[PDB]
Design a protein around this ligand. Structure first.
Ligand SMILES: CCc1ccncc1CNCCCCSC[C@H]1O[C@@H](n2ccc3c(N)ncnc32)[C@H](O)[C@@H]1O
Length: 614
């Protein structure tokens, strides 16, 4: 309900201090009438009032955030001086919502790409309807904090970004990906966002930092012009050999002459960068002498970088990032090849590489999957794909052709779980068990139980079972993302007890490998989800975890080993995993001692798992 950024930004003392100092300066120079656009909990509005502003107006788009801001403003005894408005800034009218035009607008409607929260649209409206005229004293003319911003770019090598946007291989577990199928991510999604200061495997600067654009938030003509301004065509010198994976983008906010904020990548700051993946080139290798060329525009809200190309000295298949990461997950496909060949082998080795009767193999993977083609290559197999999108069907037809399938070897199941034919049964059913989120898929136990009945004698659900592993960690990061840590970070203002009512018990879409934390235990098996034998499912159980190290336990990250058979397991935490992980974050951190035996109480019901300290 409450975006994680509200917790991180409220816990950033440095940022609170700098916004307070800028709002203080402006108010005491006589900006005593303030509109806070995107107020969240209302901390900037409370800075303005306490700085001596006469009237403060705070608008917030989210019902949840507006109600929270009402509660926080009241709790800090500022109900009377601060008018909270449940409204998009665009829908503020004078005198209906605000009595008079205001001397100061403060806005934190800002994303990693600066523009992605509609600031340009808001400030154009603000200048036109809501602000006093600009300077041609301070009580008599309109001004905006932030005043202006410089946007910076850098060409980078980053395999972690690459593996989500480009398919890196021509051959997966003995199937050929044909040249005549081009895979593109959806960023070909104007950008992704990334804490680049700790992206798994890091990044390499291939160019110097280069200025992309400047913006003056106090110049209405300039903001009005962005909409129709001709894209800047630019060309950036290469200073290092490497693979061109992305343009990394950040910015400096000038709040006023003396106060600025940088979203430059750093472990010292909370800020993320905008990331523009590079794809649909013949070659990605760049070296000193080359230029990185691109068009930069800001016409329809977002900063777009397009036509990214390298100046030196054919069916398209759109995949989600998860599906691109999947095709780049080699051990996943090699596991399936091996484990499928073993199940085929132990049921009819004669049909592995009644003659007319194949192995029937059903793939119920959620999205795009090449498992059926891999199954196809193993023996006399009739493989079934569960792809819905026409584009996926065409790609798989073309991949089939490239691996010497006769036409209509690969069948499409959608074009309910049922028998393959009237009096026939499945040799393998593949179920999708774990969400990209790192949570167990809903209704999986139902799908398993239905699927069990539809199997040939000695046939298998893949995976047969799944072990969930956990780790005791001390993570201040996970804590500061989860909960405001008291009053001192918000400069005495009392916000934590109100926002912390919206603590999430579980952080999903977590990159474990990147996480700054201290391990307090070794991995430990937390529960078994067994698709072949439901009786082995952990109902409710306690787990004794040996504490290897003294620390403040804040979280229990968790991932899965998915067993295709007893020898072959997939790791959702693997380097190349197309799954994210998750973590239980404690409402209250617990202190643990080396030698202690901590008890986790683990409640499991369907696809939901409670994990608690006892
Ligand atoms: C330095 C920024 C940064 C840089 C790098 N990495 C991360 C960040 C952090 N950015 C967090 C985005 C937070 C989301 S926007 C903040 C609040 O404003 C609200 N809103 C949005 C538009 C809007 C409107 N026109 N009228 C009223 N309210 C509005 C949202 O409902 C939200 O509560």
């Amino acid at each position: 309900l409450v975006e994680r950024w509200h917790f991180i930004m409220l816990n950033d003392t440095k940022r609170n201090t700098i916004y307070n100092a800028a709002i203080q300066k402006a108010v005491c120079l006589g900006s005593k009438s303030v509109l806070d656009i995107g107020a969240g909990t209302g901390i900037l509005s409370m800075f303005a009032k306490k700085a001596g502003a006469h009237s403060v107006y705070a608008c917030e788009l989210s019902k949840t955030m507006y109600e929270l801001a009402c509660d926080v403003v009241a709790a800090n005894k500022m109900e009377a001086g601060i008018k909270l408005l449940h409204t998009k800034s665009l829908d503020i009218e004078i005198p209906k919502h605000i009595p008079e035009r205001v001397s100061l607008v403060v806005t934190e409607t800002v994303d990693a790409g600066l523009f992605g929260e509609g600031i340009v649209e808001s400030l154009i409206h603000a200048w036109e309807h809501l602000l006093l005229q600009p300077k041609t004293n301070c009580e008599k003319y309109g001004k905006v904090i932030p005043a202006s911003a410089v946007i910076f770019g850098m060409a980078v090598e980053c395999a972690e970004i690459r593996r989500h946007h480009r398919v890196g291989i021509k051959d997966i577990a003995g199937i050929h990906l044909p040249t005549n199928v081009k895979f593109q991510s959806p960023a070909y999604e104007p950008y992704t966002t990334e804490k680049m200061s700790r992206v798994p495997g890091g990044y390499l600067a291939l160019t110097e930092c280069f200025e992309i654009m400047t913006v003056d938030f106090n110049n209405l003509q300039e903001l009005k012009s962005l909409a129709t301004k001709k894209p800047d065509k630019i060309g950036i010198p290469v200073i290092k050999e490497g693979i061109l994976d992305a343009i990394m983008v950040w910015f400096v906010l000038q709040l006023d002459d003396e106060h600025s904020l940088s979203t430059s990548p750093s472990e010292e700051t909370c800020w993320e960068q905008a990331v523009y993946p590079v794809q649909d080139l013949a070659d990605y290798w760049i070296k000193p002498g080359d230029h990185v060329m691109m068009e930069v525009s800001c016409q329809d809200c977002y900063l777009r970088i397009q036509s990214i190309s390298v100046l030196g000295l054919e069916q398209t298949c759109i995949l989600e990032s998860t599906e691109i990461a999947l095709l780049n997950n080699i051990p996943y496909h090699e596991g399936f090849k091996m484990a499928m060949s073993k199940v085929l082998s132990s049921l009819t080795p004669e049909k592995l590489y009644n003659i007319l009767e194949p192995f029937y193999v059903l793939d119920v993977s959620e999205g795009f999957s090449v498992l059926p083609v891999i199954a196809g290559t193993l023996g006399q197999v009739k493989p079934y794909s569960s792809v819905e999108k026409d584009q996926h069907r065409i790609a798989l037809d073309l991949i089939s052709e490239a691996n010497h399938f006769p036409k209509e070897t690969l069948e499409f199941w959608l074009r309910m779980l049922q028998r393959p034919k009237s009096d026939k049964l499945w040799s393998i059913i593949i179920l999708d068990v774990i969400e990209p989120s790192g949570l167990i898929q809903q209704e999986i136990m139902e799908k398993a139980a239905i699927s069990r009945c539809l199997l040939q004698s000695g046939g298998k659900i893949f995976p047969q079972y799944v072990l969930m592993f956990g780790l005791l960690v001390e993570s201040q990061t996970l804590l500061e993302e989860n909960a405001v840590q008291g009053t001192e970070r918000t400069l005495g203002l009392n916000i934590a007890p109100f926002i912390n009512q919206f603590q999430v018990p579980i952080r999903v879409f977590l990159d474990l490998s990147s996480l700054p934390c201290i391990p307090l235990s070794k991995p430990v098996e937390l529960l078994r989800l067994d698709l072949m034998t439901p009786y082995l499912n952990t109902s409710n159980r306690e787990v004794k975890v040996y504490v290897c190290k003294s620390g403040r336990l804040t979280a229990i990250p968790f991932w899965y080993h998915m067993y295709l058979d007893e020898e072959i397991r997939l790791d959702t935490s693997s380097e190349a995993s197309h799954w994210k992980q998750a973590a239980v974050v404690l409402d209250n951190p617990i202190q643990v001692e080396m030698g202690e035996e901590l008890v986790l109480s683990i409640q499991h019901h369907k696809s939901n798992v409670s994990i608690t300290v006892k």
